[PDB]
Design a protein around this ligand. Structure first.
Ligand SMILES: [Cl-]
Length: 157
């Protein structure tokens, strides 16, 4: 129970911090980079919690993990939409495009690591194909918005 609770609370914290990031992009007056950093470190803390499994988990664990992973699928589109709104304002700030680009790239890597940690865990083998499928689709979307934002921001800059 406590291992599984730590895992799922960590995944819920990731979704909370992602909503906080999307809000900061849309409504923020830097503080934006802080929001990306906090999301990154929530992902890292989820990796740590997944890696702390040392003992088989109960038979309801893989379905609870699937439920906690489900909201992640909506993150790239929400972030993409917010970034499109603020693109021109971000491009106006010296080094703005490059700071967002660097954070988008890192955020994609930290999500992919967390997905892979779950997908490749022997304690989560019963959902390996589902988690791997979600991982790849997250990656595709996360890459497309990263490359789209970078190319459009450079030009508006
Ligand atoms: Cl839980």
């Amino acid at each position: 129970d406590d291992i599984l609770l730590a895992i799922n609370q960590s995944l819920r914290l990731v979704d909370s911090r992602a909503a906080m990031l999307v809000s900061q992009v849309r409504h923020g007056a830097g503080s934006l980079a802080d929001s990306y950093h906090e999301l990154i470190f929530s992902l890292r803390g989820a990796v740590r919690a997944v890696d702390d499994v040392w003992r088989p988990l109960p038979k309801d664990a893989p379905m609870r993990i699937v439920e906690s992973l489900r909201p992640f699928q909506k993150i790239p589109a929400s972030l993409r939409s917010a970034l499109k709104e603020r693109l021109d304002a971000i491009a106006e700030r010296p080094g703005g495009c490059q700071a967002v680009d660097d954070n988008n790239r890192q955020l994609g890597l930290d999500f992919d690591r967390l997905y892979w940690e779950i997908a490749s865990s022997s304690s989560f083998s019963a959902i390996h194909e589902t988690v791997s499928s979600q991982q790849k689709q997250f990656e595709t979307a996360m890459r497309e918005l990263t490359d789209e934002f970078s190319s459009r921001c450079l030009r508006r800059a």
